[PDB]
Amino acid sequence: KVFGRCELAAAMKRHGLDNYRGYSLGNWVCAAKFESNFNTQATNRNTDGSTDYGILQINSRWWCNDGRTPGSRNLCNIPCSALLSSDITASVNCAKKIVSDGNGMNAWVAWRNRCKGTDVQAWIRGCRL
Ligand SMILES: [Cl-]
Ligand SMILES: [Cl-]
Ligand SMILES: [Cl-]
Ligand SMILES: [Cl-]
Ligand SMILES: [Cl-]
Ligand SMILES: [Cl-]
Ligand SMILES: [Cu+2]
Ligand SMILES: [Cu+2]
Ligand SMILES: [Cu+2]
Ligand SMILES: [Cu+2]
């Protein structure tokens, strides 16, 4: 599923990401925009052989099991395919664990490089949530 901007904002807020760990809703929408372009089916191979999955490009090196990432963990206790669903629950639950792991949203390199410090409220402008 490719979410609309406002549609995703609404869904993220319904799933409790708004202000989760102090990160406003616009931070999460911004991250999803630059990680996946709001596409729940996005997958991308990394240099280390892991793969990123879903709307928030969660990495198989720590967070999910894809069966092909040697030496990796599965800290969200899910198959990486669960992160590609039209239903964003598994991605949200796993993101909540990631953003609580010590470095906040810096875990998402694209959030650090493209969202951090910007006017992220723009991402929820005009939205019926
Ligand atoms: Cl957009
Ligand atoms: Cl915001
Ligand atoms: Cl593996
Ligand atoms: Cl392994
Ligand atoms: Cl959803
Ligand atoms: Cl609402
Ligand atoms: Cu709330
Ligand atoms: Cu990544
Ligand atoms: Cu893994
Ligand atoms: Cu709502």
UniProtKB/Swiss-Prot annotation:
Pfam families in the record: Lys
UniProt-annotated binding residues for substrate: 101
Disulfide pairings: 6-127, 30-115, 64-80, 76-94
Alphabetical UniProt keywords: Allergen, Antimicrobial, Bacteriolytic enzyme, Disulfide bond, Glycosidase, Hydrolase, Secreted, Signal
Entry keyword Membrane: no
GO BP term, pick one: killing of cells of another organism
E.C. no: 3.2.1.17
Annotated active site: 35, 52
GO MF terms held by the record: beta-N-acetylglucosaminidase activity; identical protein binding; lysozyme activity
Subcellular location: Secreted
Tissues expressed in: In the egg white and polymorphonuclear leukocytes.
Predominant cellular place of this UniProt entry's protein: secreted
Entry's family note: Belongs to the glycosyl hydrolase 22 family.
Subunit structure: Monomer.
Biological function: Lysozymes have primarily a bacteriolytic function; those in tissues and body fluids are associated with the monocyte-macrophage system and enhance the activity of immunoagents. Has bacteriolytic activity against M.luteus.
Protein name: Lysozyme C
Organism name: Gallus gallus
Gene name of the encoded protein: LYZ
